Amino acid sequence: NAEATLGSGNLRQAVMLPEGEDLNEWIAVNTVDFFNQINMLYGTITEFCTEASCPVMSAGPRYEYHWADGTNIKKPIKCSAPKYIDYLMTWVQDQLDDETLFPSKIGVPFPKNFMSVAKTILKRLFRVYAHIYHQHFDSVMQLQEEAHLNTSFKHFIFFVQEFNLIDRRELAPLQELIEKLGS
Amino acid sequence: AKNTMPLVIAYNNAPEDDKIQKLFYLQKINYLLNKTQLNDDLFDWINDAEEGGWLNELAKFSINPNASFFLKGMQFAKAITEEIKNKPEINSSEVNIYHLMQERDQLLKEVEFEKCATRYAEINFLLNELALNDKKTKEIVERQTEILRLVAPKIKAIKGESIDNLPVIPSYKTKELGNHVNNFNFKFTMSGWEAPFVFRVEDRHELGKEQELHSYGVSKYFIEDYSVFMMRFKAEDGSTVYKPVILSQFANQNNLEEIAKQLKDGSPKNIAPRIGYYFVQLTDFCLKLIETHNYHPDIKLNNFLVHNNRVLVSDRKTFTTNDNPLASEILTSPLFAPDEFLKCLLFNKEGDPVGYNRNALWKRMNMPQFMAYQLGMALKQFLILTQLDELPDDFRNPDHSAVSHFKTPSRQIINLSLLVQELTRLDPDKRMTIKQFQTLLNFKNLPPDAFYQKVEEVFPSSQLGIAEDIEALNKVLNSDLKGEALLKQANPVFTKLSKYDPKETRLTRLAEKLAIRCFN
Ligand SMILES: [Zn+2]
Numbered sequence: 001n002a003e004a005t006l007g008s009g010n011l012r013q014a015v016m017l018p019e020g021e022d023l024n025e026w027i028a029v030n031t032v033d034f035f036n037q038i039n040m041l042y043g044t045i046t047e048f049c050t051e052a053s054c055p056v057m058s059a060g061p062r063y064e065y066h067w068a069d070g071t072n073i074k075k076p077i078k079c080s081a082p083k084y085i086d087y088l089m090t091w092v093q094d095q096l097d098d099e100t101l102f103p104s105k106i107g108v109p110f111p112k113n114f115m116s117v118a119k120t121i122l123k124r125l126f127r128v129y130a131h132i133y134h135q136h137f138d139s140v141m142q143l144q145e146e147a148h149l150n151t152s153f154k155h156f157i158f159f160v161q162e163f164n165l166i167d168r169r170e171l172a173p174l175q176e177l178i179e180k181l182g183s
Numbered sequence: 184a185k186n187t188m189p190l191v192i193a194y195n196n197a198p199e200d201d202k203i204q205k206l207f208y209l210q211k212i213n214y215l216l217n218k219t220q221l222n223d224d225l226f227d228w229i230n231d232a233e234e235g236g237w238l239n240e241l242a243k244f245s246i247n248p249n250a251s252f253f254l255k256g257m258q259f260a261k262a263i264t265e266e267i268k269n270k271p272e273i274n275s276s277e278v279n280i281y282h283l284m285q286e287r288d289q290l291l292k293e294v295e296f297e298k299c300a301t302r303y304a305e306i307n308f309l310l311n312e313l314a315l316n317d318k319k320t321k322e323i324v325e326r327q328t329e330i331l332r333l334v335a336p337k338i339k340a341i342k343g344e345s346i347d348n349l350p351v352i353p354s355y356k357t358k359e360l361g362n363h364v365n366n367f368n369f370k371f372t373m374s375g376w377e378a379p380f381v382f383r384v385e386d387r388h389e390l391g392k393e394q395e396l397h398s399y400g401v402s403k404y405f406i407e408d409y410s411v412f413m414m415r416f417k418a419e420d421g422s423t424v425y426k427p428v429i430l431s432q433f434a435n436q437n438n439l440e441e442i443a444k445q446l447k448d449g450s451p452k453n454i455a456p457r458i459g460y461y462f463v464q465l466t467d468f469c470l471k472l473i474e475t476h477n478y479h480p481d482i483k484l485n486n487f488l489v490h491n492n493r494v495l496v497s498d499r500k501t502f503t504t505n506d507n508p509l510a511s512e513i514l515t516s517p518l519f520a521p522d523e524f525l526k527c528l529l530f531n532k533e534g535d536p537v538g539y540n541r542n543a544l545w546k547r548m549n550m551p552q553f554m555a556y557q558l559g560m561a562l563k564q565f566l567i568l569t570q571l572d573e574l575p576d577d578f579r580n581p582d583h584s585a586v587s588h589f590k591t592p593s594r595q596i597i598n599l600s601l602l603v604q605e606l607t608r609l610d611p612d613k614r615m616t617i618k619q620f621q622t623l624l625n626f627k628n629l630p631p632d633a634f635y636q637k638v639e640e641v642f643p644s645s646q647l648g649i650a651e652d653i654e655a656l657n658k659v660l661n662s663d664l665k666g667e668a669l670l671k672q673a674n675p676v677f678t679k680l681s682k683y684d685p686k687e688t689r690l691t692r693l694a695e696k697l698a699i700r701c702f703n
Contacts, residue, residue, distance in 0.1 A: 009622035036456035141319040144403040
């Protein structure tokens, strides 16, 4: 009822690095995919994620998230979940639209720091999944979309695990769910 | 035609200590009024509020006659559970609400009370347990109950409206003009709810099909309906006709066609991932609908609403249980219909359907393969509308792929364009199935050559009759020769490929990779 999934191809196979494929390009195209998925899924419950419902960005009472600014030198900011996430999506889209960072042309190479950029992006995408599961799964159930959410999260976390792109300590807010979907 | 009279008799004859038997016949009658075309007399019967009337007796059990199929079922379940003395084995984690509803409806459909009383009470007990102890079910019941309570005055005003003043709705199978305006399809909000609600009048005289679908998992893709009731309208002749009026939330993001057009002015790398997000829902809906032995013959982007980024359907008048119907027994849009359907029509100048030909008297459609084609054309229209303001004149030409309208296609666009061609083959038995399509959507980020290999593993080319020519192109491609010396060992296979009544896309793709090697 709650751990439902959709029909799909085998996701363990869909995240495997194809033969002869550059690892950076495989991370790039799946990162763009996963961002759009979590962006769309957060759009489904966005009217239930308000300033009053989520005064601080979190993943349950044990995991408070601050925003580490990339342009201003200041302590990571404690802010609401709508403010955190509405800025995260704009921030990630700018990285994906930047052709110095996520090149879409043939002869344009990836930067030396691409792997650190993509892992910062994927870390903050996880924080949106974690906030949805901990603070808005009730709204997810009212929209009858738990299978689509679980399948998107299953695909996303299988890719993170395939290439070890998020630290295990950061995955802690959903460790029980990761294990349940990966058995 | 008012076939409920033996159940009114049984209800009256039931002892009144046995209110479970009473409730069983009330729900049995209710299951039958939903399958019955209303005449003038049956309308006043189902709208009788004084004692001895249908509505008066449902109020006795706190059952709302205007409640949605699901909530009216749960209100019956609550009333029945107040009367059960032997409590079944409570097992909530082992219960499927759709399975309980389906088996309850089969009892109401054809089973007598003597043969099912105990199982009828336990099913309703289990349903009520979900309404009490399952947070998901409880909040659904709480929301629909509140909305139904706040819209009661509007419902009585609609029923209280004059018939000389009630609207006539003209018929048309289009979307360019849009939805016709009557007094009832006007958005509104209720105090405390930011989302707007809307009433819709459907073109049907009974909800027999609607009633079966709301007990199946596929109903997750239905816009949530909060109230249902039949209403008097004026016909073309002026006589009284009876149509259902359904209350639901207003879909706040228009439909899938408009969603694709908005992607034209966004980041291009978002197109293919968002198509995945939307078509994962379309594909799951189709498979879930097919699981109920129901089929959708009018699949097209603008027939799927989007509300809070959720793909939903509200036009279900066209659903059929017939997997092999004749062309005259289904409603569809000719622009997206497969050729097996178009070959049953006659056309005037410029190509407009004007009727059916001889073929319509015997030619049948395989609805699953029919749906695969239409799903393919939905993907093709979606892809194209992210690049062009209107659909091109060559949209139905299979030799003109969706990727041919992209100036700088990514690999995912190339892979999605190939899926379109696999779903829209001329021969229905050689089309990719929706299940195969569902498998391949998760591999769209693969390099095009690797994605083609994935298609071959899922849908082997031997099953298209092209295995003979696949080895002919592979033999030359596996050769060490290059340049013009390879081209004259590739000339015979090339000419054999130009003699194809419809070009097979899988051979058109392999011949090009072989043509490249010949040029040096
Ligand atoms: Zn929130």
